[PDB]
Design a protein around this ligand. Structure first.
Ligand SMILES: CC(C)[C@@H](NC(=O)[C@H](CS)NC(=O)CCC[C@H](N)C(=O)O)C(=O)O
Length: 328
């Protein structure tokens, strides 16, 4: 099995005012986006050591009682309004992975989208402060940190495509973004449940099958355990781990709006029996956000693709991924 070319891109110029330097960053984003579709963002400014430490303390201290109280409706029939946000339970002997998902901290009972009961919008559920002191404050602060990184990356993608730097970012707003953080625990287990291992067509043991991401872009932290593979025409290639950087790739909404000029890379998660963390931030826009598709390969940029509302995209995409690859 070969190794994918995943460049490390210093994204620090995207936080600054040196326009030529931002253009050199954009060129590197463009080149990675048209090759394997992945790159590591380095010099990103986020304290990933603290992220990893506070996530670990959470995963290792939460109890079965608390997991039921936080569970999404797939695991608790009482929580009919928790489709996205809350706890995704493991099943001993059957399902190894478990995770906690939270959304925009600004979705409160008073928020107009929550009052209108708009699909894909939910109010976050949190554990008890006295049992997990500081966890919610940390988690909400992390949301806005990674929001800020993601904003800057979106300026890079816009410049890469020949657009003004706010082309995407203007639709990525603290008041209405559907972006989510997921804090995923992949446990070490001995014996490891066979039901939690999937076998690929090519014989590879997997934790999660091939997919395109449901996102504009995906901004991922992982601990230093190799697990991801990306599909190329010549087969799947291993993505090397780097627990100092954020791994970035496009989701299928970027592919839609660029007429597949920036493909959403197909990737999958290999089975590794190792205790690790996978902490994606899915960059979603607002429910009513629509970006007119264009084709950068054409002088005039004309595209025949229909504009697609981000809310409709996301609603269908999340369900399709569950149907295709299973409830996580
Ligand atoms: C590879 C990582 C991104 C991670 N995979 C994942 O998180 C997988 C594939 S991209 N993603 C999902 O299941 C979508 C979760 C969406 C979330 N519930 C929400 O409501 O917004 C993993 O480690 O399995």
């Amino acid at each position: 099995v070969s190794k994918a070319n995943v460049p490390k891109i210093d994204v620090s110029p995207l936080f600054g005012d040196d326009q030529a330097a931002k253009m050199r960053v954009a060129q590197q984003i463009d080149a990675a986006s048209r090759d394997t579709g992945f790159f590591y963002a380095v010099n990103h400014g986020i304290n990933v050591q603290r992220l990893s430490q506070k996530t670990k303390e959470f995963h290792m201290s939460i109890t079965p009682e608390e997991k039921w109280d936080l569970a999404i409706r797939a695991y608790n029939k009482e929580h009919q309004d928790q489709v996205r946000a809350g706890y995704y339970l493991s099943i001993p002997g059957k399902k190894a992975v478990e995770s906690f998902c939270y959304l925009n901290p600004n979705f409160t009972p008073d928020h107009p989208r929550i009052q209108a009961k708009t699909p894909t919008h939910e109010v976050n559920v949190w554990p008890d402060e006295t049992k997990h002191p500081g966890f919610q404050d940390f988690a909400e602060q992390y949301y806005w940190d990674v929001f800020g990184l993601s904003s800057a990356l979106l300026k890079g993608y816009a410049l890469a495509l020949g657009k003004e730097e706010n082309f995407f970012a203007r639709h990525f707003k603290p008041d209405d973004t559907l972006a989510s953080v997921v804090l995923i625990r992949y446990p070490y287990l001995d014996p490891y449940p066979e039901a939690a291992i999937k076998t690929a067509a090519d014989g590879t043991k997997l934790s999660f099958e091939w997919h395109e991401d449901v996102s504009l872009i995906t901004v991922l932290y992982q601990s230093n355990v190799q697990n991801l593979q990306v599909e190329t025409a010549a087969g799947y290639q291993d993505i090397e781990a780097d627990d100092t950087g954020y791994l970035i790739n496009c989701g299928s909404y970027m592919a839609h709006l660029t007429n597949n000029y920036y493909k959403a890379p197909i990737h999958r998660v290999k089975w590794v029996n190792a205790e690790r963390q996978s902490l994606p931030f899915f960059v979603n826009l607002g429910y009513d956000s629509v970006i007119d598709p264009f084709d950068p390969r054409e002088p005039n940029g004309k595209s025949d693709r229909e504009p697609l509302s981000y809310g409709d995209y996301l609603q269908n995409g999340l369900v399709s991924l569950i149907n295709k690859n299973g409830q996580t």
